[PDB]
Design a protein around this motif. Structure first.
Motif, PDB file in Angstrom:
ATOM      1  N   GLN A 202       0.649  -1.182  -0.053  1.00  0.00           N
ATOM      2  CA  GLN A 202       0.072  -0.107  -0.160  1.00  0.00           C
ATOM      3  C   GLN A 202       0.715   1.108   0.113  1.00  0.00           C
ATOM      4  O   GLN A 202       0.368   2.292  -0.150  1.00  0.00           O
ATOM      5  CB  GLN A 202      -0.827   0.088   1.073  1.00  0.00           C
ATOM      6  N   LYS A 203       2.188   1.144   0.299  1.00  0.00           N
ATOM      7  CA  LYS A 203       3.244   2.146   0.087  1.00  0.00           C
ATOM      8  C   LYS A 203       3.691   2.080  -1.423  1.00  0.00           C
ATOM      9  O   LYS A 203       4.448   1.010  -1.944  1.00  0.00           O
ATOM     10  CB  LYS A 203       4.276   2.123   1.023  1.00  0.00           C
ATOM     11  N   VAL A 204       3.586   3.313  -2.288  1.00  0.00           N
ATOM     12  CA  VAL A 204       3.843   3.364  -3.595  1.00  0.00           C
ATOM     13  C   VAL A 204       5.212   4.382  -3.641  1.00  0.00           C
ATOM     14  O   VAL A 204       4.674   5.348  -3.893  1.00  0.00           O
ATOM     15  CB  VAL A 204       2.416   3.544  -4.381  1.00  0.00           C
ATOM     16  N   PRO A 205       6.284   4.003  -3.732  1.00  0.00           N
ATOM     17  CA  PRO A 205       7.361   4.750  -3.825  1.00  0.00           C
ATOM     18  C   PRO A 205       7.419   5.664  -5.155  1.00  0.00           C
ATOM     19  O   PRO A 205       8.388   6.552  -5.198  1.00  0.00           O
ATOM     20  CB  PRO A 205       8.855   3.955  -3.705  1.00  0.00           C
ATOM     21  N   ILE A 206       6.877   5.103  -6.376  1.00  0.00           N
ATOM     22  CA  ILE A 206       7.040   5.501  -7.681  1.00  0.00           C
ATOM     23  C   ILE A 206       5.839   6.825  -7.706  1.00  0.00           C
ATOM     24  O   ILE A 206       6.051   7.832  -8.812  1.00  0.00           O
ATOM     25  CB  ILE A 206       7.017   4.566  -8.634  1.00  0.00           C
ATOM     26  N   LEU A 207       4.964   6.948  -6.999  1.00  0.00           N
ATOM     27  CA  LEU A 207       3.974   8.099  -7.031  1.00  0.00           C
ATOM     28  C   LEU A 207       4.259   9.141  -5.922  1.00  0.00           C
ATOM     29  O   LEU A 207       4.558   8.833  -4.869  1.00  0.00           O
ATOM     30  CB  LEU A 207       2.623   7.778  -6.639  1.00  0.00           C
ATOM     31  N   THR A 208       4.308  10.462  -6.454  1.00  0.00           N
ATOM     32  CA  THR A 208       4.700  11.583  -5.751  1.00  0.00           C
ATOM     33  C   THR A 208       4.143  12.779  -6.084  1.00  0.00           C
ATOM     34  O   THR A 208       3.526  12.786  -6.944  1.00  0.00           O
ATOM     35  CB  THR A 208       6.480  11.474  -5.687  1.00  0.00           C
ATOM     36  N   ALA A 209       4.362  14.026  -5.599  1.00  0.00           N
ATOM     37  CA  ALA A 209       4.131  15.328  -6.013  1.00  0.00           C
ATOM     38  C   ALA A 209       5.550  16.126  -6.032  1.00  0.00           C
ATOM     39  O   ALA A 209       5.975  16.665  -5.211  1.00  0.00           O
ATOM     40  CB  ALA A 209       3.238  15.708  -4.612  1.00  0.00           C
ATOM     41  N   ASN A 210       5.866  16.321  -7.635  1.00  0.00           N
ATOM     42  CA  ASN A 210       6.986  17.153  -7.840  1.00  0.00           C
ATOM     43  C   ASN A 210       6.822  18.425  -7.437  1.00  0.00           C
ATOM     44  O   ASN A 210       7.473  19.449  -7.453  1.00  0.00           O
ATOM     45  CB  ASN A 210       7.495  16.973  -9.195  1.00  0.00           C
ATOM     46  N   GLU A 211       5.499  18.800  -7.084  1.00  0.00           N
ATOM     47  CA  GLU A 211       5.006  20.242  -6.921  1.00  0.00           C
ATOM     48  C   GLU A 211       5.750  20.820  -5.573  1.00  0.00           C
ATOM     49  O   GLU A 211       5.959  22.094  -5.486  1.00  0.00           O
ATOM     50  CB  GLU A 211       3.780  20.384  -6.683  1.00  0.00           C
ATOM     51  N   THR A 212       6.174  19.852  -4.582  1.00  0.00           N
ATOM     52  CA  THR A 212       6.771  20.258  -3.560  1.00  0.00           C
ATOM     53  C   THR A 212       8.226  20.477  -3.662  1.00  0.00           C
ATOM     54  O   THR A 212       8.941  21.185  -2.650  1.00  0.00           O
ATOM     55  CB  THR A 212       6.982  18.873  -2.454  1.00  0.00           C
ATOM     56  N   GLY A 213       8.825  20.698  -4.844  1.00  0.00           N
ATOM     57  CA  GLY A 213      10.227  21.170  -5.131  1.00  0.00           C
ATOM     58  C   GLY A 213      11.087  20.148  -4.897  1.00  0.00           C
ATOM     59  O   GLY A 213      12.459  20.376  -4.679  1.00  0.00           O
ATOM     60  N   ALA A 214      10.883  18.733  -4.144  1.00  0.00           N
ATOM     61  CA  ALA A 214      11.682  17.774  -3.800  1.00  0.00           C
ATOM     62  C   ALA A 214      11.832  16.758  -4.954  1.00  0.00           C
ATOM     63  O   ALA A 214      10.704  16.401  -5.420  1.00  0.00           O
ATOM     64  CB  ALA A 214      11.222  16.925  -2.469  1.00  0.00           C
ATOM     65  N   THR A 215      12.809  16.201  -5.013  1.00  0.00           N
ATOM     66  CA  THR A 215      13.208  15.337  -6.336  1.00  0.00           C
ATOM     67  C   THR A 215      13.422  14.041  -5.281  1.00  0.00           C
ATOM     68  O   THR A 215      14.563  13.645  -4.791  1.00  0.00           O
ATOM     69  CB  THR A 215      14.402  15.776  -7.094  1.00  0.00           C
TER      70      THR A 215
ATOM     71  N   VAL B 156       2.712   1.386 -15.357  1.00  0.00           N
ATOM     72  CA  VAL B 156       1.303   1.938 -15.789  1.00  0.00           C
ATOM     73  C   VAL B 156       0.952   2.849 -14.868  1.00  0.00           C
ATOM     74  O   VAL B 156       1.154   2.629 -13.342  1.00  0.00           O
ATOM     75  CB  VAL B 156       0.304   0.860 -15.845  1.00  0.00           C
ATOM     76  N   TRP B 157       0.760   4.161 -15.092  1.00  0.00           N
ATOM     77  CA  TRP B 157       0.558   5.173 -14.186  1.00  0.00           C
ATOM     78  C   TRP B 157      -0.918   5.651 -14.380  1.00  0.00           C
ATOM     79  O   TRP B 157      -1.373   6.118 -15.555  1.00  0.00           O
ATOM     80  CB  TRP B 157       1.399   6.543 -14.712  1.00  0.00           C
ATOM     81  N   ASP B 158      -1.465   5.578 -13.236  1.00  0.00           N
ATOM     82  CA  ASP B 158      -2.976   6.032 -12.787  1.00  0.00           C
ATOM     83  C   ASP B 158      -2.929   7.425 -12.363  1.00  0.00           C
ATOM     84  O   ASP B 158      -2.587   7.638 -11.391  1.00  0.00           O
ATOM     85  CB  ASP B 158      -3.581   5.274 -11.505  1.00  0.00           C
ATOM     86  N   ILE B 159      -3.308   8.455 -13.030  1.00  0.00           N
ATOM     87  CA  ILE B 159      -3.146   9.897 -12.561  1.00  0.00           C
ATOM     88  C   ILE B 159      -4.367  10.116 -11.682  1.00  0.00           C
ATOM     89  O   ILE B 159      -5.410  10.233 -11.899  1.00  0.00           O
ATOM     90  CB  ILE B 159      -3.085  10.731 -14.019  1.00  0.00           C
ATOM     91  N   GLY B 160      -4.027  10.482 -10.484  1.00  0.00           N
ATOM     92  CA  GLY B 160      -5.015  10.828  -9.400  1.00  0.00           C
ATOM     93  C   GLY B 160      -4.359  11.851  -8.220  1.00  0.00           C
ATOM     94  O   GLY B 160      -3.664  12.678  -8.554  1.00  0.00           O
ATOM     95  N   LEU B 161      -4.417  11.501  -6.905  1.00  0.00           N
ATOM     96  CA  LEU B 161      -4.176  12.400  -5.903  1.00  0.00           C
ATOM     97  C   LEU B 161      -2.460  12.856  -6.132  1.00  0.00           C
ATOM     98  O   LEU B 161      -1.989  14.017  -6.038  1.00  0.00           O
ATOM     99  CB  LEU B 161      -4.558  11.984  -4.546  1.00  0.00           C
ATOM    100  N   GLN B 162      -1.758  11.824  -6.406  1.00  0.00           N
ATOM    101  CA  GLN B 162      -0.289  12.206  -6.352  1.00  0.00           C
ATOM    102  C   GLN B 162      -0.146  12.326  -8.100  1.00  0.00           C
ATOM    103  O   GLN B 162      -0.477  11.571  -8.731  1.00  0.00           O
ATOM    104  CB  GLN B 162       0.614  10.799  -5.948  1.00  0.00           C
ATOM    105  N   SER B 163       0.214  13.564  -7.978  1.00  0.00           N
ATOM    106  CA  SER B 163       0.448  14.314  -9.437  1.00  0.00           C
ATOM    107  C   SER B 163       1.480  13.795 -10.477  1.00  0.00           C
ATOM    108  O   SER B 163       1.476  14.017 -11.508  1.00  0.00           O
ATOM    109  CB  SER B 163       0.379  15.858  -9.285  1.00  0.00           C
ATOM    110  N   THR B 164       2.504  13.399  -9.963  1.00  0.00           N
ATOM    111  CA  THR B 164       3.874  12.676 -10.469  1.00  0.00           C
ATOM    112  C   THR B 164       4.314  11.485 -10.373  1.00  0.00           C
ATOM    113  O   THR B 164       4.013  10.840  -9.541  1.00  0.00           O
ATOM    114  CB  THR B 164       4.892  13.588  -9.875  1.00  0.00           C
ATOM    115  N   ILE B 165       4.655  10.733 -11.519  1.00  0.00           N
ATOM    116  CA  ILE B 165       4.985   9.519 -11.522  1.00  0.00           C
ATOM    117  C   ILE B 165       6.347   9.349 -11.624  1.00  0.00           C
ATOM    118  O   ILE B 165       7.104  10.529 -12.278  1.00  0.00           O
ATOM    119  CB  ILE B 165       4.471   8.652 -12.856  1.00  0.00           C
ATOM    120  N   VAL B 166       7.407   8.495 -11.123  1.00  0.00           N
ATOM    121  CA  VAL B 166       8.836   8.521 -11.177  1.00  0.00           C
ATOM    122  C   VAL B 166       9.288   7.114 -11.735  1.00  0.00           C
ATOM    123  O   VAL B 166       9.327   6.289 -10.831  1.00  0.00           O
ATOM    124  CB  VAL B 166       9.192   8.808  -9.721  1.00  0.00           C
TER     125      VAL B 166
END
Lengths: 256, 273, 40, 236, 273, 236, 59, 40, 40
Positions: free
Chosen positions: E13-26, F152-162
């Motif tokens: 349930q922890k997904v390390p590949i999904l994030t928010a680059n909007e935070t300015g952190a890489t 496979v990237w589901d676009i949702g609350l987390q806005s960025t995929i890495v």
């Protein structure tokens, strides 16, 4: 804690100088004059120490400070060559060494204005007024007790008399690096400067060389109150101190 | 080490900013004595201001030209520039003279570095391989009289040989008769009405003679020899008022007549900025 | 390491680290402390 | 023999390198050292001594009068003297501090500025010494100068005032040569009250101005001065 | 040190590949976070990428030509190329400027290496043995005015002499007034409507004057002097966006008008390879 | 004196040797070091930071639009973008990673490729990021790309995929300059489902693309870049 | 090989420097030293002996 | 072995071995651990 | 440090420090002390 500092007195031999408007006396390079020690001596002749017979205050002829006077210059020991037993010993011995306590006096009223710079310059080598490579003749550099008046005109074979350039090519405002004291008539009537022996050798010829040169130069011109005489007397008093003489020989011959 | 101490408000009967400069003492008043300051550190030692550093870098003291040409039909080899003499003194260059003449007595070990450079203003087909001889003539020793004089043998006098274009460097101990050199002398050679003032054997280091030891060639080569002096183990006594006016002669304090003003007059009154 | 016999062959001594400007700034007979009256 | 490789710059003449070299007088014994008063180890000792500033540099030729700052009686809220603070130029160029400063490129630390009064013993005056840090205009009034660093001086038994100019700079070092970004500011003097002269006394009285360095003064990067020059080599 | 860790299947349930680059952190996402990997080692330290290594190799900073000829019938010796002056700055060569200008502040010790090379475009019979003088003129010191000016005596200014064809090399400590050099300055010399922006005494290292100390000859020799700078003990702060467009002046950020596109347009649509 | 023999190559100028040399300013004290934020010890620190990739490099002139990857609504099983993976050329040449990479000859390790969505908050899309290792054709369909490494990237609350591109190579180092034997492979993006827009909303939405290095990235053999050049020396 | 830099004044002939140098007769044994009366170590020994002064130099 | 008096005469210091990219890659007030939601 | 095999390759020995001028100044059979009569 009740006391005063303007009152000080110096007794050397049978002479005593007293003061009531003095500025703290100056000791050149914070070093009191002393006898030549065995670890520095070169000539083997045992030195003659005349003590109280020469170590006393001699007053030089007073000079008159006018509103247009440029300044005054004396050479030591030349200025004391006619002063008692010091003057004779200085010519009867081949080599001599001596410190000095210089005391300059210029008294005035509470309405007078003016300031003198009293400064001692070691090896004050004078410039001739003719420029180029011209030398200053012995007779103009060794005047004796009447000294050099910087207000007078220049002379052939003589030194230059522009006080602002210190008779040697330096400016007057920079003389404060040498041991000095000011006689500000508003604060003081007397300057005092204790000089040790300053030379590159332990003992030296007193007839061919002047170790120090005393200059008294008015910076702020004499300003007398309305109706007073536009002149003030200056008396210079010098005492040889910690004096040493070596190599007695027939009396030395000098020009004039 | 602290430069400025931490200091707050002052309400006292002891006033460190009021004094009497008439006493000849310059009171050690600090920034903390006139206004309220914060604690800061010096973070500096002052090594570049040491008397050993202020006088301890090279400066040229003499420049002279010497020529390789036949000595036939010449009466004076020094006037033909076949050899040249230098009365050793450090008072020919004003940049070095003013620094050194800021003190009354100075005692230092010397380090001479000689740079010889060749030139063919007249027609020459190749760069000649000239060797220069620098000979020290202490007072009393016979100064060379000819480019091929017996004096150049140098059975006892110090001498150095080097190729033109390259440099030579030799150290010299303190050679003064007294304990320190006299930069100024308020006196004479003897008690005489016509003798020399200031310039006297107190400032006589000796002489240096320069020649091209190579024989003469078919082409004339002018060699400019440049002597540089760098002081080591420097000691100085009695600091002096700085020189202001231009000089006129070696070993004497004279200045020119009709000299220009040294004080830079301000534009406007005493109130302008 | 010194490569020669004489002291004159040596490099500089660096700096004389103990300094004291008082012998030039205040060469006065009686010692004067700042804040106390220079004259009284 | 040891195989070695010479780096670039071999046989070049650098006027600042301090390496050993052979003596031209081997086995020579130098004259003994003697005690001579006034030994100088570093220039930070002598630059700390006061020298007179030619503040009245408004004369056609150099005169003793150039060191005397004029004071005039019955002047209210007026300037006595004013100057920019380039210590390697202007009124400071001829002083010992300014002249020693000109042998270096960079300077830092606090300056000691002093004034000595020479009017009559029955005379009185109150003056305001004001230092204006850089960035601000040279002051046009006492109210403008008094807004900055200042000392109100009551002229009395103590004949001399000593106002220390605190080091006010962002950059750690300023240039000795006049450059505007590294400008030190301005100095001005004004009448706080007025100069009152005793009866039967006339004209102008004078102040003497002095400059010296604080023990926190620093100088670096040595250079030759432009206060002296020559066109031809000197002879004896 | 491990580069990639051993990693098997992921059901979490922890997904390390999904994030928010909007935070300015890489986010430090590793190869092991997107797919299954094996254990491997770095077996590399990164010494060639150190700021001391990226800025610590020599590059030319100035090139200048000087001539040995008679000074008779010339009013300007610098325009006759008898001597030349260089305002010290590292912004004349774009290869070095872009590397150094990648940081906002840099503090380093310098090492200059000067290479002088001779040339006879006109008739000459031999290769002259010329000696070049390189003189450092710090701000405030008198810049030489003539090839034989009194300034060249160098009583206090650092100076180096070397034979043409060979090289000279001298180190220089950090000379900036501040704690680090300013590669960029968003400010002015004073609060003025017409003053200089960016170029100011913050970037003023001083000047270097170059002359042939040898006298003038019968033949003209053009000597190209090349100055190389190599940094030591390098420290850098505030990394910056890299320069993209060509430059137009020293110490200023200007670019040419009508400049070419910097993005290399692709051949075909956004879907082509 | 010690007998020595000079080896060949004595007095030659090598621009990379690090030997000691004499100071031109002896006894000089440098300005103290101060705390300045943002100190860089090595380039592997800053190359690890994301920079935007101009993936839409299909414009006539450089524009902000070149950084925006277009997404179109109601597109099934179609490509979004495609590129070869020469990090010292193409879309990467102007990025910080590609620009720093161009100062070196050899590169190794894993790349971090990231996409940020900018469409409306009520909008949805599912995308497939696919990396194709070298040796295989650039993919022509999602079925062909999905056969390789993919996210496979589901676009949702987390806005960025890495999606991290794993180091797939036989040889330990690849060249930064485009060479076919040391080619890194290909990147493609495809619609996994489709882009669905909320009512009362129109046109194309955009993705922003970013590139950075993993802590296992390596660079070696320094060289001058060809991204800047000059014909004449610059002046002040 | 050790990287070195030659200082100015390299290859110059100074008549006073005392450095080592190679022998032109390697492995040579010199004649033994014998006791000879009158050995002089320094000139300050012999300058201390009286010599006649030609005071009547008026011939 | 150093053959000169000044620190400016020395060769390079090599490499600053302790590196930390976090001050440039993640300069954020609250610390973010990978796998946990960046935002909640 | 000596860089050669032979003693002839060495630099000077400096100075012979123990001096005695008596063998040249007073080479007399009976010893004569100053102040006592030379002859009696």
């Amino acid at each position: 804690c009740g006391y005063s500092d303007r009152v000080q007195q110096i007794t050397l031999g049978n002479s005593t100088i007293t003061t009531q408007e003095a500025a703290n006396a100056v000791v050149c390079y914070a070093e009191w004059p002393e006898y030549l020690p065995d670890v520095d001596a070169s000539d083997v002749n045992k030195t003659s120490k005349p003590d109280t017979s020469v170590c006393r205050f001699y007053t030089l002829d007073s000079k008159t400070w006018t509103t247009g006077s440029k300044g005054w210059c004396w050479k030591l020991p030349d200025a004391l060559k006619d002063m008692g037993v010091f003057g004779q010993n200085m010519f009867f011995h081949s080599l001599g060494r001596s410190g000095y306590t210089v005391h300059v006096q210029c008294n005035a009223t509470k309405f007078h204005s003016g300031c003198l710079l009293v400064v001692v310059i070691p090896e004050h080598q004078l410039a001739s007024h003719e420029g180029g490579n011209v030398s200053v003749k012995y007779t103009f550099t060794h005047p004796g007790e009447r000294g050099i008046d910087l207000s007078s005109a220049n002379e052939v074979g003589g030194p230059v008399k522009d006080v602002i350039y210190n008779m040697n090519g330096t400016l007057l405002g920079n003389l404060l690096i040498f041991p000095h004291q000011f006689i500000n008539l508003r604060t003081n009537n007397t300057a005092t400067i204790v000089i040790p022996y300053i030379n590159s050798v332990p003992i030296d010829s007193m007839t061919r060389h002047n170790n120090v040169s005393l200059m008294v130069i008015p910076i702020a011109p004499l300003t007398v109150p309305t109706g007073a005489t536009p002149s003030l007397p200056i008396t210079v008093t010098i005492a040889p101190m910690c004096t040493e003489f070596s190599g007695i020989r027939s009396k030395s011959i000098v020009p004039q | 080490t602290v430069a400025s101490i931490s200091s707050g408000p002052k309400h006292t009967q002891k006033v460190p900013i009021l004094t009497a400069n008439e006493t000849g003492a310059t009171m050690p008043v600090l920034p903390s004595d006139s206004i309220e300051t914060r604690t800061t550190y010096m973070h500096f030692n002052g090594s570049e201001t040491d008397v050993e550093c202020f006088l301890g870098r090279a400066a040229c003291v003499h420049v002279t030209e010497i020529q390789n040409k036949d000595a036939t039909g010449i009466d004076n080899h020094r006037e033909a520039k076949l050899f040249n003499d230098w009365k050793i003194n450090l008072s020919s260059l004003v940049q070095l003279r003013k620094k050194l003449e800021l003190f009354t007595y100075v005692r230092f070990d010397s380090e001479y570095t000689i740079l010889a450079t060749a030139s063919q203003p007249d027609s020459a087909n190749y760069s000649s391989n000239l060797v220069v001889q620098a000979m020290y003539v202490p007072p009393g020793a016979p100064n060379p009289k000819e480019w091929d004089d017996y004096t150049w043998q140098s059975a006892s006098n110090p001498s150095v040989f080097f190729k033109v274009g390259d440099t030579s460097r030799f150290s010299v101990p303190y050679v003064g008769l007294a304990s320190a050199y006299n930069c100024f002398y308020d006196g004479y050679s003897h008690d005489d009405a016509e003798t020399q003032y200031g310039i006297t054997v107190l400032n006589h280091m000796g002489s240096m003679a320069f020649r091209i030891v190579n024989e003469h060639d078919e082409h004339k080569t002018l060699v400019k020899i440049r002597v540089y002096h760098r002081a080591k183990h420097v000691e100085a006594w009695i600091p002096r008022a700085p020189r202001a006016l231009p000089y006129t002669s070696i070993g004497r304090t004279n200045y020119p007549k009709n000299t220009e003003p040294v004080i830079k007059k301000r534009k406007g009154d005493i109130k302008s900025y | 390491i010194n490569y020669y016999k004489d002291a004159a062959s040596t490099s500089s001594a660096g700096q004389s680290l103990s300094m004291d400007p008082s012998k030039f700034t205040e060469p006065v007979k009686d010692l004067m402390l700042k804040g106390a009256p220079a004259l009284n | 023999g040891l195989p070695t490789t010479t780096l670039p710059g071999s046989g070049q003449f650098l006027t600042t390198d301090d390496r050993q070299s052979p003596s031209a007088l081997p086995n020579y014994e130098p004259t003994p050292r003697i005690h001579i008063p006034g030994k100088v180890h570093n220039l930070l000792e002598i630059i700390q001594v006061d020298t007179l500033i030619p503040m009245n540099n408004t004369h056609t030729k150099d005169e003793v009068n150039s060191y005397l700052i004029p004071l005039n009686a019955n002047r209210q809220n007026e300037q006595v003297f004013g100057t920019n603070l380039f210590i390697g130029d202007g009124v400071f160029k001829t002083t010992l501090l300014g002249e020693i400063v000109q042998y270096y490129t960079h300077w830092s630390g606090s300056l000691r500025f002093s004034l000595m009064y020479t009017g009559p013993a029955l005379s009185s005056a109150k003056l305001i010494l004001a230092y204006t840090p850089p960035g601000a205009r040279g002051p046009q009034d006492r109210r403008e100068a008094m807004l900055g660093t200042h000392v109100v001086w009551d002229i009395g038994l103590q004949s001399t005032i000593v106002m220390t100019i605190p080091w006010t700079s962002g950059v750690q070092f300023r240039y000795t040569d006049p450059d505007t970004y590294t400008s030190a500011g301005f100095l001005s003097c004004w009448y706080q009250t007025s100069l009152i002269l005793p009866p039967e006394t006339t004209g102008q009285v004078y102040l003497l101005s002095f400059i010296s360095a604080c023990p926190d003064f620093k100088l670096r990067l040595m250079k030759d001065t432009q206060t002296i020059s020559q066109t031809v080599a000197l002879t004896e």
